Amino acid sequence: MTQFEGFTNLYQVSKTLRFELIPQGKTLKHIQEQGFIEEDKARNDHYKELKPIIDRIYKTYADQCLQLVQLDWENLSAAIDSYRKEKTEETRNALIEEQATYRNAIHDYFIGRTDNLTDAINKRHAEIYKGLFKAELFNGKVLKQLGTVTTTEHENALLRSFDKFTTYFSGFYENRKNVFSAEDISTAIPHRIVQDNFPKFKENCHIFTRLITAVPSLREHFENVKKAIGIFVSTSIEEVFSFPFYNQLLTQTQIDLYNQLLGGISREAGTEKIKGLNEVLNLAIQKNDETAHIIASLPHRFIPLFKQILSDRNTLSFILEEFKSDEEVIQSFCKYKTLLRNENVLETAEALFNELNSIDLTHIFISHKKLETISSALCDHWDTLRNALYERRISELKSAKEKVQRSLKHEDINLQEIISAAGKELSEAFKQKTSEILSHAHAALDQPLPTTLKKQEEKEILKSQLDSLLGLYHLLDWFAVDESNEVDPEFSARLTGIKLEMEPSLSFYNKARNYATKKPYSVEKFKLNFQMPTLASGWDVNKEKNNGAILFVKNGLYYLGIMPKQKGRYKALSFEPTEKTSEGFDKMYYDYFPDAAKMIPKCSTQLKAVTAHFQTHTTPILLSNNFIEPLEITKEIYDLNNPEKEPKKFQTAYAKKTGDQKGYREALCKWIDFTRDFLSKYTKTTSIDLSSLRPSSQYKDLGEYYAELNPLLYHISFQRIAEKEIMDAVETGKLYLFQIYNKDFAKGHHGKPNLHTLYWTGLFSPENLAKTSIKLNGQAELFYRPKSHEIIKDRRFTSDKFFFHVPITLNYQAANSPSKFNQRVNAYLKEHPETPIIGIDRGERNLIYITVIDSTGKILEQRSLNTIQQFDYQKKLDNREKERVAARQAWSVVGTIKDLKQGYLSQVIHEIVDLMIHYQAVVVLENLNFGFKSKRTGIAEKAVYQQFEKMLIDKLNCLVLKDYPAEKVGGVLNPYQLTDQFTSFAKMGTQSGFLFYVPAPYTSKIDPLTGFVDPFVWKTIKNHESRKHFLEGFDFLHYDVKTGDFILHFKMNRNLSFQRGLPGFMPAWDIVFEKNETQFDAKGTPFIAGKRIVPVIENHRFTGRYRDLYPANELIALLEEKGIVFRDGSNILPKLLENDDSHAIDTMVALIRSVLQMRNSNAATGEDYINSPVRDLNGVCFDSRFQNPEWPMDADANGAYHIALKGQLLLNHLKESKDLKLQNGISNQDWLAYIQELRN
């Protein structure tokens, strides 16, 4: 018996708030005269310049370390193959433990505990490894022991510039700590070595082995192209794709040579490219041979390896040098232009072209690789000139035509034979386009260069000159200048004499593009330190001398106080907590023991003195300092904390590995009494009440006890401080005072406050002071950003500002992570079966469509959110897309989409949470592959497929309603928690709390009245005999005389090869070819019923736009075309199947394909709908154009509805199950069987 309001305070969530600090008094003067802002700007610049040096040291240690790795890989290969062949759970855990073993084996080289290495280099690697995460990378001691990087004196001075400020690199350290770590982290060296690169190498090895086994005649070829690449010269082409060579494939250079072996060296522009592995695979594919088909059947693509983590990328391919500045590019192109007019190239080209217009053209030839380009630029189609020449060679003569077309691809043609093959329209089009191009070039040379390159117009005119010159170069590359044919030697020589100086314009074009499309520089905020090695890392009153960041509250306003260092020392300035009635600021007092799991052993067991006492003698030791009463450290407690093994005996890892529940329980009990009397005895924690703690033997584990213990030691009090002391503190410069500010703290604000402002007010409301549910955290950052009725546009960028970023944590009383959250949600859904279901369909046309269904599948509300607050976000986002791709092609600025997508997604998120709190329903969302959504966003990033999922998860993880009371469930004190804690999409399961991930196939293309899908696939129906065979499988066809319709009967025990093999429930189908007459909707608008939209096929494997069709009209036109009598209602199929002409059979398969076509779309006028081919058993032929609200209006509403009944299946399967866990998805066959059972 649980409630909907019980889903609160499940787990901690961490957020960050941003504010603007307004200076108070003359403190803005005090930071200005002291010169801190420029000092932090130079410090950030120094850090940015020092980062390449320090990870140069990191890369040096890496490539010195993992070069010595030599391991077997057969166990991991067998584990991967076993898990891939049989996808069971225990095989998965075997794969994880093998991957962890190999990760530890790789990491031991960094650690220095590697078995195969001898002891001296082991201790050298260990003591060098001890220095990458301390101050040892700046004193040069690591540089002395590790290989001689030998940073120059400039970088030595740069390292001296960070003297006594190594804690600024502290966040860097935990960054690089993930590089050298083995706990399965995606930003680690051994995770990439084991889990990422090794399966790819195994795949390459296996596909190479089966490709050699299938066809070995290509075996020599790869060795040959290996001699083309000239790398791995001491290795065999079989040995490279063997497992042990992977012991070489760790350094960046070796994987670079592997990827370049797969790709091939690319030389400079103009010359050919050295072919590689995938190149020759594609070339063998494109032969249209039987060998091409068999290599097409197996996979025919080698996969490149991922880059190493911290290393840098090189190549053997040609790299084009980049233009350093805009002045250099405009100056160099001005000299290029002047040297080009000095060579009088334009009149030279005019001379050549009036020569080709006035001499015979049998002695001038055209290269065979440009016939398609000339055909596409000249005529409307690229296949015009090739087919014209092919038919002309036929007419001047089956097999002979094939050798003719084999000769056409590689033999160069003289241009008169093309003129005689084509028409004179080709000649005049050629002459006018040459006129157009040389007039463009003339305008290019006549027009002067722009003065600068800072704005768009100069960029676009320079682009215009460049592609005019380049198009002249392309037009120059049409002719076959080689003396292999009978080209005129003088004209060939002068065409080289123009083309060799037309060649560098292409490289100039690429250089200008590489300089031109750079992102324009923008002013960026940077971190302030205020000459302090640790700024605002904590709020504690002991560290308030060191961190120097405290807060004041003044009659509802909030202030940040910073204590600067006086004369380079820590001036311990304090205040007097006067009585409450005195006017003044209210200082917050912070009492925080950070985390007992790391403070307790550090402050009591992991000291130097206790260890020095305990190695030499075993007697227990009293500890006196920082204690009211000295605490006793016994032998067994230190053995529990330091057991010289990974499983600590109070940790449940020891209980899981061993099974001694009694000893683990007693060890846990003793450890809990030890931490109890330590918290009693310690100076900081002796004033904290600990009475809510249960007896020690009643505690299940360490994590639960820590979760209950943690929010007792977090405390905030408030003490009134005299105002005059604070004003003398700021006026003397001893205190930097700032005011936290946003939009809602202005005096003119009278509406509802922001959600972040609600969190900030809930932080300091006395209810949260009584019981801390939300918590102020440490590590608060300060940033400075330089500058970039009456209404001011972009007023916030007019002046330089100070910004404050502060982390908070909501649901602090709850545990850090939830336990069995999905079990709780399954329990609540099992106790509440009547809950609604919200189908969300994300699309590319209308984007987001919602449908609401009840427990019985009745529609409650359906909506397409193209227009929210009467604003068409879809159309605006589409035109933003159109101008983004237009600006990309025009070398303009590219902008961003994230802001507008975030605004529209915020509107739709508020809508769906409004309906969520109104209906207490669950949402259902289609499971989509990452590759599919990535390709969909690639063809059109108008779709929000992957972006909206993150916003839904983030909003449903921590949910606060602004209109709700604070103390009520859903307010800022008890926020709603309806989804699992977000970890990563890889470990995101099929169900995250109230959200479900349902399979994507077969949701849109389904009749909701009968559950009908198309059981055929039309790709298998290609030949005429296949069409006749499939026409044999139908039962019979009858012409209705009342309504003029056609009824075709079908049983799925026929046409099995032409069926897709998806057996539905209902064993009969009656396809209805309804008469194409005009019906009316609920609005009464006329519309012709049963019409279809079919793409217009141009020729074989060629399709254009789409055209409407009315299947009964052309069908009866077919029957009166052949003279078939059908008004008697006889069996039409045996009457028509005897006619063996292919045109007839093609017509009826076209009509039955069109009536079996479900999704009927027309984007030109924009009608999207479906028209069910099978009549409902109550005699209804469904069209969604009827606009009846009980059924979906359009096809995407239909898809969202079917996703909703898929979720209905999911919760029915939840109800009948007793394990309180969902099934691992559903299959298509069970889904369509279930919906056919429900419908009919």
Partner RNA sequence: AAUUUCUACUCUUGUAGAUGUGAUAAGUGGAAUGCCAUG
Q: Which of residues 1019-1078 bind RNA (CB under 7 A)?
A: none
Residue of the chain from 456, 1103, 1131, 1217 that contacts DNA (CB under 7 A): 1103
* Euclidean distance between CA atoms 1205 and 223, whole angstroms: 58
Breaks in the chain (C–N > 2.5 Å) following residue: 397, 788
| CA–CA dist 734, 725 (Å, integer) | 11
Strands (E), 117-200: none
Alpha-carbon span 263 to 985, nearest angstrom? 31
Report how far residue 1144's alpha carbon sits from residue 1149's, in angstroms, rounded to the nearest whole number. 9
307 appears as a binding residue in the annotation:
yes
Q: Does 869 bind RNA (CB under 7 A)?
A: yes
- Residue among 41, 936, 1135, 1159 flagged as catalytic: 1159
Q: Is 1108 a catalytic residue?
A: no
Q: At 1080, is the secondary structure helix, strand, or coil?
A: strand
CA distance 435 to 427: 12
Stretch that binds DNA, among 551-559, 895-903, 1029-1037, 1071-1079 (CB under 7 A): 895-903
The reply to whether 176 sits in an annotated binding site is yes
d(CA 92, CA 987): 14
Shortest Cβ 1054–DNA spacing (Å) = 20
1199 is in an annotated binding site: no
Q: Is 43 designated active site? A: no
For residue 1186, the 8-state DSSP code is: G
Tokens at residue 281, please?
Answer: 């695979």
Is 595 one of the annotated active-site residues of the chain? no
Query: By CB under 7 A, is residue 1078 in contact with DNA?
Result: no
Stretch that binds DNA, among 389-397, 941-949, 1076-1084, 1185-1193 (CB under 7 A): 941-949
- Per CB under 7 A, the list member of 299, 703, 733, 1063 interacting with DNA is 703
Which H or E run includes 1071? Answer: strand 1069-1073
The one among 592, 821, 828, 904 contacting DNA by CB under 7 A: 592
Assess 756 for contact with RNA (CB under 7 A). yes
Give the footprint of DNA on residues 952-1011 (CB under 7 A).
983-987, 1000-1005
> Was 139 annotated as part of a binding site?
no
Integer Cα distance of 428 and 431 in angstroms: 5
Which has the closest alpha carbon to 1183: 1091, 1115, 1050?
Answer: 1091
Kindly identify the residues of this chain, within the stretch 755-784, that bind DNA according to CB under 7 A: 775, 777-779
CA atoms within 13 A on the CB side of 325: 4
Among candidate residues 397, 1220, 1092, the one with its CA nearest the CA of residue 831 = 1220
The answer to the question of residue 419 lying near RNA (CB under 7 A) is: no
Which residue type is seen at 371? L
# of chain residues touching DNA (CB under 7 A) = 136
756 is in an annotated binding site: yes
Measured from the CB atom, is 272 or 1190 closer to DNA? Answer: 272
* Interface pick for RNA out of 84, 513, 882, 1143 (rule CB under 7 A): 513
Residues 290-309 that bind DNA (CB under 7 A): 301-302, 304
Closest CA to 33 of 971, 736, 894: 736
Q: Which of 38, 163, 396, 790 binds RNA (CB under 7 A)?
A: 790
Is 50 annotated among the ligand-binding residues?
yes
Angle at the Cα of 368 from the Cα atoms of 367 and 373, rounded to 5 degrees: 90
Q: Which does 184 bind (CB under 5 to 8 A by kind): DNA, RNA, none?
A: DNA
User: Considering only 30-38, 507-515, 762-770, 983-991, which stretch makes contact with RNA by CB under 7 A?
Assistant: 507-515
Cα 554 to the center of its chain, rounded Å: 45
Half-sphere exposure of 333 toward its Cβ, with a 13 Å CA cutoff? 29
Reading the block at residue 1050, the tokens are: 């079908």
> Smallest distance, Å, CB 401 to DNA?
22
User: What are residue 696's phi and psi, to 5 degrees?
Assistant: -65, -35
Q: According to CB under 7 A, which residues from 1094 to 1153 bind RNA?
A: 1100-1101
87 makes contact, choosing from RNA, DNA, none, with CB < 5 to 8 Å by partner type, with none
Question: Per the annotation, does 751 bind a ligand?
Answer: yes
Task: Give residue for tokens 């609401």.
Answer: 852
The residues in 270-289 that bind DNA, with binding defined as CB under 7 A, are 273, 276, 278-279, 282
DSSP letters for 1219-1230: SS---S---HHH
Would the annotation count 747 as a binding residue? yes
Q: Find which of RNA, DNA, none residue 844 binds, CB within 5 to 8 Å per kind.
A: DNA
- Partner in contact with 590, chosen from RNA, DNA, none, beta carbon below 5 to 8 Å by kind: DNA
Query: Annotation-wise, does 474 bind a ligand?
Result: no
Q: Count CB atoms within 10 A of the CB of residue 806.
A: 23
Q: Are 724 and 22 in contact (CB under 8 A)?
A: no
Residue 1135 contacts DNA per CB under 7 A? no
564 binds DNA (CB under 7 A): no
Contact (CB, 8 A) for 463 and 890: yes
Q: Is 821 in the site for DNA (CB under 7 A)?
A: no
Inter-residue contact 509 to 470 (CB < 8 Å):
yes
The response to whether 356 counts as a known ligand-binding position is no
The distance of closest approach from Cβ of residue 586 to RNA in the complex, given in angstroms and rounded to an integer, is 23
> Which residue in 398, 569, 608, 793 is the catalytic one?
793
Interface with RNA by CB under 7 A: which range of 28-36, 233-241, 933-941, 1066-1074? 933-941
- Return the residue of 306, 570, 797, 871 that touches DNA, per CB under 7 A: 570
Closest CB to DNA among 685 and 1010? 685
Residues 577-606 that bind RNA (CB under 7 A): none
Burial class of 645 by CB neighbour count within 10 A (0 to 12, 13 to 18, 19+):
exposed
Q: Where are the alpha helices (DSSP H) in 753-814?
A: 755-764, 766-770
DSSP alpha helix (H) spans, 1126-1169: 1132-1137, 1142-1155
Is 175 one of the binding residues for RNA (CB under 7 A)?
Answer: yes
Q: Which amino acid is at 1024?
A: H
Taking CB under 7 A as the criterion, the residue among 123, 221, 724, 749 binding RNA is 749
| From 241, 539, 964, 1234, residue interacting with DNA (rule: CB under 7 A) | 539
Quick check: 986 binds RNA (CB under 7 A)? no
Residue from 448, 556, 568, 748 that binds RNA (CB under 7 A)? 748
Active site residue 1194: no
- DSSP three-state, residue 775: strand
- Distance in Å, CB of 513 to RNA, minimum: 5
- Site residues for RNA, 40-79, by CB under 7 A, read 48, 51, 55
| 882 sits near DNA (criterion: CB under 7 A) | no
Reduced to 3 states (helix: H, G, I; strand: E, B; else coil), residue 1012 is coil
Confirm whether residue 1202 is marked as ligand binding.
no
- Number of chain residues interacting with RNA (CB under 7 A): 103
| Residue 694 near RNA by CB under 7 A | no
d(CA 275, CA 833): 63
Complex with DNA: residue 441 or 596, whichever CB lies closer:
596
Structure tokens at 735: 């205190």
From 43, 1027, 1196, 1239, the catalytic residue: 1196
- Rounded to 5 degrees, φ, ψ at 982 are -75, 125
Asked about 884 being catalytic, the answer comes back as no
Asked whether the beta carbons of 980 and 993 are under 8 A apart, the reply is: yes
Alpha helices, DSSP H, located in 832-928: 873-889, 898-919
The two most distant CA atoms of the chain are separated, in Å, by 114
Per partner kind, with CB cut-offs from 5 to 8 A, the member of RNA, DNA, none near residue 310 is RNA
Catalytic residue of the set 841, 980, 1074, 1194: 841
Q: Which of 898, 1022, 1083, 1218 binds DNA (CB under 7 A)?
A: 898
The values of phi and psi at residue 853, to 5°, are: -125, 155
The token duo for 415 is 């241009």
x/- track of binding to DNA for residues 1164-1203 (CB under 7 A): -----------------------------------x----
- Binding-site annotation, residues for crRNA: 47-51, 175-176, 307-310, 747-756
So which residues are the catalytic ones?
793, 841, 926, 1159, 1196
Binding residues: 47-51, 175-176, 307-310, 747-756
